[PDB]
């Protein structure tokens, strides 16, 4: 169309990462994984901390 060639020329002129298409989307998605997945994986081992230690020793 009327923006493919200009876009390619500008991208070649400015050899930068992030591919220019979704900067706001990248800035939105970047902190979300750290906020969510880290805070949901921490309980997985934090909660069984008191549960851990079952020696079940018999003699």
């Amino acid at each position: 169309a009327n923006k493919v060639i200009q876009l390619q020329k500008i991208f070649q002129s400015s050899t930068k990462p992030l591919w220019w298409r979704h900067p706001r989307s990248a800035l939105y998605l970047y902190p979300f994984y750290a906020i969510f997945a880290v805070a949901v994986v921490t309980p997985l081992l934090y909660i069984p901390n008191a549960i851990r230690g079952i020696k079940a020793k018999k003699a």
Partner: peptide, 17 residues
């Protein structure tokens, strides 16, 4: 990271705490 979070979260949800 997305796949691992999915796996552990599903495991914790269907039968967990």
């Amino acid at each position: 990271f997305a796949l691992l979070s999915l796996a552990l979260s599903t495991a914790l949800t269907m039968h967990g705490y």
